[PDB]
Amino acid sequence: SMSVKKPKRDDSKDLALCSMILTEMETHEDAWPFLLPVNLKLVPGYKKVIKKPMDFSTIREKLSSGQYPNLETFALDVRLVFDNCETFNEDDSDIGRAGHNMRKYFEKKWTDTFK
């Protein structure tokens, strides 16, 4: 509360560490469904159904331009990528499996780096 603060957790490396995680996600062999924004002209249903599209290139641009106020808003966009993927894709499809694999990969790096 006013003039009463929990001890300062060092966040000075967060930007660098989120960038490293994001590089690892970008280079994973199963990243291909997520590298670029879904083409809303060419994929029927996507625009109407997926209210907030997100992809790794968009996260990379936001990261690079100071549009994440803290590491939690970064994790929210990464999870959005996988949540969108599950909304639109069957679990037993190549893309559906890719999205599960990637979410697992991310959540381990996240825990190991920050928790």
UniProtKB/Swiss-Prot annotation:
Subcellular location field: Nucleus
Domain of life the protein comes from: Eukaryota
UniProt tissue specificity: Expressed at varying levels in several tissues, whereas a smaller transcript was expressed specifically in testis.
Domain Bromo: 9-113
Annotated family: Belongs to the WAL family.
Self-association state and partner proteins as the record states: Component of the BRF-1 ISWI chromatin remodeling complex, at least composed of SMARCA1 and BAZ2B, which regulates the spacing of histone octamers on the DNA template to facilitate access to DNA. Within the BRF-1 ISWI chromatin remodeling complex interacts with SMARCA1; the interaction is direct. Component of the BRF-5 ISWI chromatin remodeling complex, at least composed of SMARCA5/SNF2H and BAZ2B, which regulates the spacing of histone octamers on the DNA template to facilitate access to DNA.
Record's function text: Regulatory subunit of the ATP-dependent BRF-1 and BRF-5 ISWI chromatin remodeling complexes, which form ordered nucleosome arrays on chromatin and facilitate access to DNA during DNA-templated processes such as DNA replication, transcription, and repair. Both complexes regulate the spacing of nucleosomes along the chromatin and have the ability to slide mononucleosomes to the center of a DNA template. The BRF-1 ISWI chromatin remodeling complex has a lower ATP hydrolysis rate than the BRF-5 ISWI chromatin remodeling complex.
Protein name, as recorded: Bromodomain adjacent to zinc finger domain protein 2B
Organism: Homo sapiens (Human)
